[PDB]
Amino acid sequence: QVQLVESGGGVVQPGRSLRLSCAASGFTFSSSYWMCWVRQAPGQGLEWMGCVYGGSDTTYYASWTKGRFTISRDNSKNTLYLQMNSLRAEDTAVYYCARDPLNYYYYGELNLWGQGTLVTVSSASTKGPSVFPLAPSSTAALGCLVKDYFPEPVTVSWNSGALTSGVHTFPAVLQSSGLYSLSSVVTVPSSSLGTQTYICNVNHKPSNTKVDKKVEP
Amino acid sequence: DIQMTQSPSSLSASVGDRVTITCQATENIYSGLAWYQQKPGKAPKLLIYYVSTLASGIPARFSGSGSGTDFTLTISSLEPEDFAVYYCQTYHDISEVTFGQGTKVEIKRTVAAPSVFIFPPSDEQLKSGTASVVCLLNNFYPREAKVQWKVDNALQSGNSQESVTEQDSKDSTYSLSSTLTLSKADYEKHKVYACEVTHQGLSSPVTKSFNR
Amino acid sequence: LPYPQPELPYPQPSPEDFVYQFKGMCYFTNGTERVRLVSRSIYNREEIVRFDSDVGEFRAVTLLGLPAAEYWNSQKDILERKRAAVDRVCRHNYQLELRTTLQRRVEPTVTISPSNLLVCSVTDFYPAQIKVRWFRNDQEETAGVVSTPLIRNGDWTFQILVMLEMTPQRGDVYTCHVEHPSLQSPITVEWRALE
Amino acid sequence: EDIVADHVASYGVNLYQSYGPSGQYTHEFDGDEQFYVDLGRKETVWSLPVLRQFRFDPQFALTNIAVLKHNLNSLIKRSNSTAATNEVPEVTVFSKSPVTLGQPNILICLVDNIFPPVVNITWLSNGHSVTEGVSETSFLSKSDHSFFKISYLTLLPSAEESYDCKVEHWGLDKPLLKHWEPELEVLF
Ligand SMILES: *[C@@H]1O[C@H](CO)[C@@H](O)[C@H](O)[C@H]1NC(C)=O
Ligand SMILES: *[C@@H]1O[C@H](CO)[C@@H](O)[C@H](O)[C@H]1NC(C)=O
């Protein structure tokens, strides 16, 4: 019934601007709560950025903002916005918008959050991940290795979804070149080597890159 | 800027265990405390507000307590769905709302040794200009494990780039992934590539290597 | 949490002055047995729109309030919260009053003096509930008695002056009899004519 | 008509006006001011010692005054810029307790039927201004949506010393001097 749908997230050059969108549905902005922004860097915790009052111009920002962020909500469109200015690698985070009562829990406890949109600060260009096979040499295990892709994320499946028991897809790491890389492996039975054709399925949604790779030990 | 200090930073417990999470404020925050749960790939969910008021729907096993600076979150008899990162939040000053660091509640199982596997760089990658050797540990407990690279028995530093899966929904184990990145000029200039792994589940360190 | 909580205004969809007012008003009868919330938005001196808990929805009181009333009634989350404000605002703050404001007892200072006109000054009392009566030799006087209205000092005290036109006799005693909730015994003060 | 009840409270008298612009946030219980919020200093100032035990987030006043700011701009344009009508205030001066020369007293100046809520309430001692001994309440609401305000002057009673309450408002062609004469103005 009620929800917040975020948009405008993606890749951004260090030193440039970006406006995030957060459209409300099932309700219209009004008094008794705050419309807020909370960012979360990969593997780290929540960091409040600022709120705009649901029923006025009353806008607050966290001390660390230094005037780089602008929180505003256009009522004609029923959308909350986040203007980000002078972006740096420190800003890379999934950005959430929330309907938070805060000092108004007494009046109503409705706590609502958007799905989150990913923002990446780097001057790196968009390119797919070159898949390289990790077949075992001379019970058993094999895998795929996706290297040098930008930006995150990338999906990995085995035998087009029919292989799930024993799969371990590693959370990607940022290389020194500003490129991502990960591995996906499967705990396969020894006798099944030479029998099945294990094919990794990799998808890079930001560059439209779907490349499949088989195992040849 | 009221600073929240959450303790522990992570903890391990089994189903049925009484779990206590603690949050500490740098000053009196007068009932301006909320508690959130956050599961992987999902935005946080509110559990409790006004220090101890259970938000609607939230199970009776969750509870809040505290006053001024010291506050606790108590899960009386833990359940499998309760393994997630918990956060405290202060809204006493709505102009400077801050979240506590976070506490990952993890499942307690028995020790498990890692199955290790080494992977020589593909001939296709070498035809581009680089060489990637990968080490792989599988289904171990706990996360503590060391993995070292040795090209011609010479120990490596700054060559490795590790990675680690979360506690499996099925066996509650982790999996590590060490990766040495070197050029084709320095790859073909050496021969024996080894990978030594040390872990609590083993009796003595286990080694895996190959020949260029 | 036991702190006073406020009622909330909602967003509208010789120098010159333009005034706006919002009053979150609570009416209590028989304690918290009968409670009524009436929130009022006033433009200058004209109430334009209102939320009365006895009606249960916003109602324009004049033309200028019809756009707000139409808009706020269309927002179901506003209505439900407004319907709940009788408890979260009125009943909540009343529990704080019971142990503080509704317990304030300030006993009055009773004085009799001339300017024949005899004035009984009953000053600095709280709460408002008072009964002041004049007597001449244990005979209740009313025909020749004129009282001021109850006077609000502003500092959480009241005063009231009750005057008696009298025909002074030698063996006469005039008594001002004051009754107030803060007194266990009613205060009786006397005046005797001298010369 | 007025609503009959045992108790009446305003858990929010919210005021915002274009002149200045200024705002006021108060709570009233049975006609008396419980506290006000100093919007400049972001601070809850209690008018009664027993209420000092409580807290009231000054942000509550600040957010509400911002809602009233929007609503004011909204109704100025909607009403075709209809401005407030200046109302002639009614001034009454009386003492807090019976007058005793050689017994200190407080002189109370009630300024009623105030509208708009912009008023100057100064005190004169034999024709000249007074600074010390002066205090005043905030603008207190009336059911007709005008205000009243009470000013105080703590003094030592003298036969020679005469006091006046000088009130300035736009509803008056020239200020208003209300002399304190103890000849029963309260009793008519
Ligand atoms: C007041 O409250 C009581 C309950 O406490 C209720 O039963 C009754 O109707 C009320 N009494 C009077 C005198 O109105
Ligand atoms: C109130 O006093 C100020 C300062 O002396 C003055 O400028 C203003 O005109 C006065 N207001 C009225 C309504 O006379």
Residue numbers in the entry:
A (entry chain A): 1 to 138, 145 to 223
B (entry chain B): 1 to 212
C (entry chain D): -2 to 10, 1003 to 1104, 1113 to 1192
D (entry chain C): 1 to 188
Manuscript excerpt for this entry:
In human celiac disease (CeD) HLA-DQ2.5 presents gluten peptides to antigen-specific CD4+ T cells, thereby instigating immune activation and enteropathy. The complementary binding specificity of the two antibodies prompted us to engineer them into a bi-specific IgG format consisting of a DQN0344xx arm and DQN0385ee arm to achieve extensive coverage against multiple gluten epitopes. Structural analyses show that the proline-rich and glutamine-rich motif of gluten epitopes critical for pathogenesis is flexibly recognized by multiple tyrosine residues present in the antibody paratope, implicating the mechanisms for the broad reactivity.
We determined the structures of DQN0344AE02 - HLA-DQ2.5:DQ2.5-glia-α1a, DQN0344AE02 - HLA-DQ2.5:DQ2.5-glia-α2, DQN0385AE01 - HLA-DQ2.5:DQ2.5-glia-γ2, and DQN0385AE02 - HLA-DQ2.5:DQ2.5-hor-3a at 2.8 Å, 2.1 Å, 2.8 Å, and 2.2 Å resolutions, respectively. Notably, the antibodies used in this study are engineered variants obtained in the process of optimization of humanized antibodies, yet the identity to DONQ52 is high (VH > 93%, VL > 94%), and the paratope residues are conserved between DQN0344AE02/DQN0385AE01 and DONQ52, and except for Glu28, between DQN0385AE02 and DONQ52. Further, for DQN0344, three consecutive Tyr residues (Tyr99, Tyr100a and Tyr100b) in the CDR3-VH loop contact Phe60α, Thr63α, Arg70β, Ala74β, and Arg77β of HLA-DQ2.5. In DQN0344, being reactive with both HLA-DQ2.5:DQ2.5-glia-α1a (PFPQPELPY) and HLA-DQ2.5:DQ2.5-glia-α2 (PQPELPYPQ), Tyr100a in CDR3-VH contacts the side-chain and backbone of P3-Pro in both gluten epitopes by arching down and deeply penetrating into the peptide binding cleft. Tyr100b and Tyr99 surrounding Tyr100a in CDR3-VH play auxiliary roles. DQN0344 tends not to bind to gluten pHLA-DQ2.5 when there is a bulky residue (i.e., Gln or Phe) at P5 of the peptide. Taken together, multiple Tyr residues, especially Tyr100a (Tyr100b, Tyr99) in DQN0344 CDR3-VH and Tyr-50 (Tyr32) in DQN0385 CDR2-VL (CDR1-VL) appear to have critical roles in the broad binding to various gluten pHLA-DQ2.5.
